[PDB]
Design a protein around this motif. Structure first.
Motif, PDB file in Angstrom:
ATOM      1  N   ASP A   1     -14.508  -5.899  55.703  1.00 50.91           N
ATOM      2  CA  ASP A   1     -14.202  -4.783  54.985  1.00 50.91           C
ATOM      3  C   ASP A   1     -12.871  -4.008  55.431  1.00 50.91           C
ATOM      4  O   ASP A   1     -12.863  -2.607  55.586  1.00 50.91           O
ATOM      5  CB  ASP A   1     -15.319  -3.861  54.908  1.00 50.91           C
ATOM      6  CG  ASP A   1     -15.254  -2.655  53.972  1.00 50.91           C
ATOM      7  OD1 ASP A   1     -14.929  -2.910  52.775  1.00 50.91           O
ATOM      8  OD2 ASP A   1     -15.681  -1.496  54.199  1.00 50.91           O
ATOM      9  N   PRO A   2     -11.629  -4.879  55.399  1.00 51.40           N
ATOM     10  CA  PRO A   2     -10.384  -4.115  55.985  1.00 51.40           C
ATOM     11  C   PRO A   2     -10.076  -2.892  55.040  1.00 51.40           C
ATOM     12  O   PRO A   2      -9.407  -1.854  55.496  1.00 51.40           O
ATOM     13  CB  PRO A   2      -9.334  -5.167  55.680  1.00 51.40           C
ATOM     14  CG  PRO A   2      -9.999  -6.309  54.814  1.00 51.40           C
ATOM     15  CD  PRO A   2     -11.462  -6.346  55.115  1.00 51.40           C
ATOM     16  N   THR A   3     -10.174  -3.000  53.866  1.00 49.92           N
ATOM     17  CA  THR A   3      -9.956  -1.741  52.926  1.00 49.92           C
ATOM     18  C   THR A   3     -10.971  -0.439  53.212  1.00 49.92           C
ATOM     19  O   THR A   3     -10.470   0.466  52.721  1.00 49.92           O
ATOM     20  CB  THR A   3      -9.936  -2.039  51.348  1.00 49.92           C
ATOM     21  OG1 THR A   3     -11.388  -2.320  50.892  1.00 49.92           O
ATOM     22  CG2 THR A   3      -9.461  -3.305  51.011  1.00 49.92           C
TER      23      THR A   3
ATOM     24  N   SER B   1      -0.698  -4.145  63.091  1.00 51.40           N
ATOM     25  CA  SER B   1      -1.341  -4.669  62.104  1.00 51.40           C
ATOM     26  C   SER B   1      -2.581  -3.742  62.033  1.00 51.40           C
ATOM     27  O   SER B   1      -2.732  -2.814  62.888  1.00 51.40           O
ATOM     28  CB  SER B   1      -1.834  -6.071  62.342  1.00 51.40           C
ATOM     29  OG  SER B   1      -3.096  -6.222  62.866  1.00 51.40           O
ATOM     30  N   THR B   2      -3.423  -3.680  60.896  1.00 55.69           N
ATOM     31  CA  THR B   2      -4.536  -2.899  60.952  1.00 55.69           C
ATOM     32  C   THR B   2      -5.688  -3.540  61.426  1.00 55.69           C
ATOM     33  O   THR B   2      -6.891  -3.122  61.540  1.00 55.69           O
ATOM     34  CB  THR B   2      -4.950  -2.884  59.204  1.00 55.69           C
ATOM     35  OG1 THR B   2      -4.957  -4.049  58.726  1.00 55.69           O
ATOM     36  CG2 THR B   2      -3.766  -2.119  58.447  1.00 55.69           C
ATOM     37  N   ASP B   3      -5.625  -4.543  62.395  1.00 55.65           N
ATOM     38  CA  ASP B   3      -6.699  -5.102  63.195  1.00 55.65           C
ATOM     39  C   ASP B   3      -6.602  -3.899  64.405  1.00 55.65           C
ATOM     40  O   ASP B   3      -5.850  -3.032  64.552  1.00 55.65           O
ATOM     41  CB  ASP B   3      -6.424  -6.420  63.796  1.00 55.65           C
ATOM     42  CG  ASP B   3      -6.108  -7.369  62.779  1.00 55.65           C
ATOM     43  OD1 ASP B   3      -7.279  -7.745  61.966  1.00 55.65           O
ATOM     44  OD2 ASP B   3      -5.060  -7.934  62.552  1.00 55.65           O
ATOM     45  N   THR B   4      -7.777  -4.110  65.320  1.00 52.34           N
ATOM     46  CA  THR B   4      -7.891  -3.171  66.427  1.00 52.34           C
ATOM     47  C   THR B   4      -7.248  -3.806  67.479  1.00 52.34           C
ATOM     48  O   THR B   4      -6.923  -5.065  67.730  1.00 52.34           O
ATOM     49  CB  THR B   4      -9.368  -3.083  66.842  1.00 52.34           C
ATOM     50  OG1 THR B   4      -9.979  -4.195  67.309  1.00 52.34           O
ATOM     51  CG2 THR B   4     -10.239  -2.489  65.542  1.00 52.34           C
TER      52      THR B   4
ATOM     53  N   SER C   1     -17.899  -5.126  59.191  1.00 50.77           N
ATOM     54  CA  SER C   1     -17.267  -4.269  59.999  1.00 50.77           C
ATOM     55  C   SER C   1     -15.864  -4.170  59.305  1.00 50.77           C
ATOM     56  O   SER C   1     -15.720  -4.984  58.292  1.00 50.77           O
ATOM     57  CB  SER C   1     -16.919  -4.844  61.498  1.00 50.77           C
ATOM     58  OG  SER C   1     -16.028  -5.729  61.421  1.00 50.77           O
ATOM     59  N   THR C   2     -15.093  -3.459  59.635  1.00 49.87           N
ATOM     60  CA  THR C   2     -13.767  -3.085  59.026  1.00 49.87           C
ATOM     61  C   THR C   2     -12.835  -4.199  59.423  1.00 49.87           C
ATOM     62  O   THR C   2     -11.416  -4.435  59.231  1.00 49.87           O
ATOM     63  CB  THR C   2     -13.062  -2.024  59.059  1.00 49.87           C
ATOM     64  OG1 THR C   2     -13.023  -1.437  60.449  1.00 49.87           O
ATOM     65  CG2 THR C   2     -14.102  -0.816  58.424  1.00 49.87           C
ATOM     66  N   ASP C   3     -13.186  -5.122  60.409  1.00 49.74           N
ATOM     67  CA  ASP C   3     -12.265  -6.408  60.695  1.00 49.74           C
ATOM     68  C   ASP C   3     -12.236  -7.415  59.300  1.00 49.74           C
ATOM     69  O   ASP C   3     -12.945  -7.305  58.399  1.00 49.74           O
ATOM     70  CB  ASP C   3     -12.992  -7.050  61.578  1.00 49.74           C
ATOM     71  CG  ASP C   3     -13.220  -6.381  63.079  1.00 49.74           C
ATOM     72  OD1 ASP C   3     -11.926  -5.892  63.440  1.00 49.74           O
ATOM     73  OD2 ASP C   3     -14.408  -6.045  63.499  1.00 49.74           O
ATOM     74  N   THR C   4     -11.088  -8.044  59.403  1.00 49.01           N
ATOM     75  CA  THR C   4     -11.012  -9.388  58.265  1.00 49.01           C
ATOM     76  C   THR C   4     -11.995 -10.515  58.549  1.00 49.01           C
ATOM     77  O   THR C   4     -12.881 -10.761  59.668  1.00 49.01           O
ATOM     78  CB  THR C   4      -9.722  -9.892  58.378  1.00 49.01           C
ATOM     79  OG1 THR C   4      -9.360 -10.792  59.525  1.00 49.01           O
ATOM     80  CG2 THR C   4      -8.592  -8.665  58.115  1.00 49.01           C
TER      81      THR C   4
END
Ligand SMILES: [Cl-]
Ligand SMILES: [Cl-]
Ligand SMILES: [Cl-]
Ligand SMILES: [Cl-]
Ligand SMILES: [Cl-]
Ligand SMILES: [Cl-]
Ligand SMILES: [Cl-]
Ligand SMILES: [Cl-]
Ligand SMILES: [Cl-]
Ligand SMILES: [Cl-]
Ligand SMILES: [K+]
Ligand SMILES: [K+]
Ligand SMILES: [K+]
Ligand SMILES: [K+]
Ligand SMILES: [K+]
Ligand SMILES: [K+]
Lengths: 167, 171, 167, 164, 166, 164, 166, 167, 167, 171
Positions: free
Chosen positions: J98-100, H71-74, J71-74
């Motif tokens: 900011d996931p995008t 997924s795009t999570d870390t 942050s770029t987390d959801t």
């Protein structure tokens, strides 16, 4: 190939029975047309082919078909040739001159490194659509009675859609 | 104009004294050349111009000047014209066919809407340099006598770089 | 060549008979015009050429023909040359200065490496169509009477459409 | 037109009298070939044209001429058609399949709006040069006799150049 | 401006002291050079300027300064001006012809809509570097003694590098 | 992938239980549809996949789901195949022909080197949205039961959004 | 050169007589203007030039000539120069700051590798047309009386159009 | 679709059984791989799918198949999720974090206006070739036993070319 | 921001302790550097900022940190300002002149409409990597001690890789 | 830098005091805003910085300053972090996801090779203009006290255009 595509506009001078005339695509509208290409006046293969068409010309006219021979020579040269070959002399259809090669290129039929047209014949219906194509090398003569057969078949399918006549 | 520029390479077929030959730019090297363009075989002004040139052809050959007439007709058509016109019949120089137009376009001499060359005459020195240009309209014929005058003038200035030929040559 | 093309608009200063004038393409409209190009004032060949045209200028005027001599020099220079040379002194047509080379390039007649015009003569009919061109090498002079003969032929075919003129 | 040009490299599967073979341009080298295109197998039209060529195939072979029919159908479909049509069944020349349309586009012969080849016949000499071309609309039939005549004329000028 | 830049190569015909010669950038190397542009031969304003300069010419020469006047006329026309004008006839330096306008454009000094140079003067040190520029309109004239002061000044700063002179 | 995008306009001929019909995107409006691609008719492989779907077709219809099989073959070939294979014969859904490959490229599903469609199944909802995609290599079989399960799940979340 | 061309619009802060003001092209309309460029405040060569000019400033003003000195320093720095230098402090005209280098580039007068102007002077008639240009190197200085003669000359030709003055 | 294409190089951090690790394409060479994409950690649809795979994982490992959830999570978020969901806790395969989205875009599987991966599963053979693809909408659950079937079939055709097993 | 990027090469004149020197990126190599940008000499806010840095400069030097103040003014101007202002007079670090704006644009810190630098401070480690940036609006002054605290933190993490520093 | 430029339009989801909401640029109009970027949820330096900001949040709200951490987390991950960290738990301001990357890229603040925002803080006036920027490296935490000082300075210069705040604010 150009099969089933519409012919392109053109404007050319022609020699036809002692007379110089102009020919455009508008002259072909509503008519069956044969565009008969050949490389050069004053050569020794073309005329019998051209003469064979001349023999069948009264028949083609009764079928409502017009014939246009085309080469990249001028209409002047056509008149000269007509005066000096007995075979060419019996031609009563339009001999179109195409010195710019525009008509020839319209039919994608130019030998670009020669400036001469390939030996190709195109059959065109009243709506401008090409319905038969024949191209041969020098010496493989184009037979006018086969041409006649193809045109009667083309005219027949035009008159009877849904029905067709094969080989 | 193309004055004082070198002619471009070419390769064309020609009719010359009863035979078909190839002509290229190599054939002109080390020679004086006249490229004599006209619109079309079997027309009306051209024969007089070409025949007038033919009359001076023997003289020209002694000046070491070659002549090449050019139109966009084929060499086959030149042969025929030569066999049907009494005027054309006396031409002994090469009749070049330029059906592709390339030779004609080399000299920037094509009427593109017509596919015919204009009435242009180009005089070319043995090193390939255009030394005299004459162009006329469709109904204006060229005088072969004045052409010779211009060629003699050109060979003079070539023979004597230290001098000049003003108006109207007289040897 | 530029044969049978229409001349481009231009606007130039000129010396003509003791005075300075402006010339444009509008002065040439409805007229026959000769544009006589030469390399440079105060050089060694042009005097005779220009002088000869001048000798014919009276007849040229009688035939409704205007003469414009052109060089890349200025009209100040032309005026001076008119005073110093008895040959140039007899010119009564317009001597145009073209120091921008604009008019010269209109006729595609510039020696780009020298900034001087080539020796070209141009005959232009009342519609602005170029009917005759003569261009010679630096050491070759032009014959004013051969020019005159060309103009008369050009005027003839203009006057008799169906006809033509050889030598 | 493609007259007097050399055919392009190709590699296609084909059905030929009971088996699946591959056909490339190398197979045409040194031979006379006829490339006979048609739009589709299993149509409602009686395939008189293919059978007509089949009738003349024994002679063609006797003249050293090979025949390849070509459509944008697969060779699988050709095997099927051959087993179900009495007319097709009598074909013994190779039926090439051209589902990528590459062979067809090589001869510039694709009806783009239809994904089918036009009714075109190409006669190719042993050096791979196209010597004769015939194209007709749907409903105008190709005559195998007229093809035979052209092939023999092409072979004659091949053997006796400049003989008029 | 072109101040403090190197001059570009050129090749021009020129009239000087009766005979025709050639001038290229190679002739200015190792010397002080004044390039004196004007609009056109055989006009009114230019001669006094050139004559004023000519007055100072023999002085200039002992300073090792060559002078080159320039217009878009031919060197032919320059020679004719030299014979018709009492003023111009006293010019001993080179009158360069620039009919192609190359030399003039090199100094970015061409009135493009006229094919004539502007009234600009350039002073060029032996390394080919422009050290002084003066340009005026078709009305104003350039004073030759003022040019001489600007030259001597340009020479001091080169012979005494690391100093300055107002 | 094309998941959650809207299908594109198309217009194809098809064979459907004894007749030739035209099929456009307008026919799919308001319905659940399955677009089932395969590479070729008349192959040497037993077409268990199409028949498997045929077996489940009565239910599919009972769920308001339409089925369209698609290959780059013509509908003529489909009629032929249907009349010669006992397995194919039991198909009553529409067999679409795609010889231009346009329908196939709409679903981005063309094997370009082969001119055949890949083994891909697309489930499309009544608003024309792709809700499920399945693609397998040659030799991996698609299971009509797993398709049925997905369709019913797609219909359930359609009717009960955000129910977890 | 820019000779005989119109000046381009501009907007600059300037120090003049104790207070800060704005200068735009609108301020030069209808007047004679001298734009006097120099390299940098607080150096050695520039002050005598500006002071020489300043000496002639009250004369200039009666001729209807505005003076605008220009460098790429701020108008802030100009004010500080005015308070530290005996020379500069006698300047009564506008010291324009050109830190963006816009005004300098307008006159094509920027040494791009330095961010400083060259020593160039421009004379601009009331119609906004450049009628005289003088550019020198970092060594040579500009004589103010010479500028005054070039201005009076430029004025005569405008008040007596169709004549010329060497 | 990406069927039958080779996977692209990637370099990503992952969480795997209490440990942070790196994963590149080189880790997949010579192995069967499942790349199991899903939109976001700490949501309520994904885990049962992920958990279903976790249930079958011992079986997949005996088949020599590696599993990578993406997924795009870390990878940090993965470790957190793993600590707080009982379902996710039973995951013992690599949870790859893809915050740059490079891996996700490699498989053409990005929702560009969301920055989240679509719910897609890719089966990849030892030579890098994708052999099965499954993509569903949210709520249409991906069934791991069907996945298992497809892999056994893929492995079988790899071992027996010329032979195949259909529906 | 330019955080964690390497500084670009530059070459500038500077006033430093009564003399004029040259500064390049090579002087900053192997050193800690502060680039302290400000708008203009002889204006109304910068004195205090620069003065504060100067107050800390002794400690900064002790920690191996070099300070470069930068404005688009010249080094001649800096020298003058150093004489006139008792605040500026206490600066013993280099006051760089950037009248080409090259160094300022290297740090992307130009007010393009004003030709003056923005109020930005940059901390650069011995490898040339930017480790801290502060930029404020025209009316907001910077705290030199907050800066010093940042430098000490940056020097700490450089010295203890595994560790970090909050407030 | 982006100093003295207007912020760009955006639209993101956020977690804020127990609920999910949308935040756009319109929500910031007429308000003072702090955009507080950090690399990643569930890491190590970030909580101290964010909590330090939370401590000053009540004070900030009285200055009419809104805070948005990014942050770029959801936003789902923010909610979880908020429910598992005692430090994060005391955040009452909006936690933007900011996931995008679009919000992060608006402020030119993305580490493109990492997909994470840098530690950047941007102060934004009610007219949308960036008035203060702070960026630190990965191991350097930010001091929320000095942040307040900078905000108070900014509102001062806004309140009194005729003056200035030099080094170190003191009201
Ligand atoms: Cl064709
Ligand atoms: Cl020419
Ligand atoms: Cl011409
Ligand atoms: Cl063809
Ligand atoms: Cl200049
Ligand atoms: Cl897809
Ligand atoms: Cl200038
Ligand atoms: Cl895919
Ligand atoms: Cl930055
Ligand atoms: Cl920034
Ligand atoms: K021709
Ligand atoms: K000239
Ligand atoms: K196909
Ligand atoms: K097909
Ligand atoms: K400055
Ligand atoms: K993310």
């Amino acid at each position: 190939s150009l099969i089933n595509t519409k012919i392109k506009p053109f404007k050319n001078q022609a020699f036809k029975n002692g007379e110089f005339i102009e020919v455009t695509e508008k002259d072909t509208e509503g008519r069956w047309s044969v565009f008969f290409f050949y490389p050069a006046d004053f050569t020794f293969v073309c005329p019998t082919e051209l003469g064979d068409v001349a023999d069948h010309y009264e028949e083609l006219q009764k079928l409502g078909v017009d014939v246009y021979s085309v080469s990249t020579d001028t209409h002047f040269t056509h008149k000269a040739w007509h005066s000096s070959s007995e075979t060419i002399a019996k031609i009563k259809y339009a001999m179109i001159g195409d010195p710019t090669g525009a008509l020839t290129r319209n039919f994608d039929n130019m030998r670009e490194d020669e400036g001469l047209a390939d030996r190709a014949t195109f059959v065109v219906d009243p709506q401008g659509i090409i319905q038969a194509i024949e191209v041969t090398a020098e010496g493989i003569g184009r037979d006018a009675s086969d041409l006649l057969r193809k045109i009667k078949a083309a005219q027949y399918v035009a008159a009877h859609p849904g029905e067709v006549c094969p080989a």
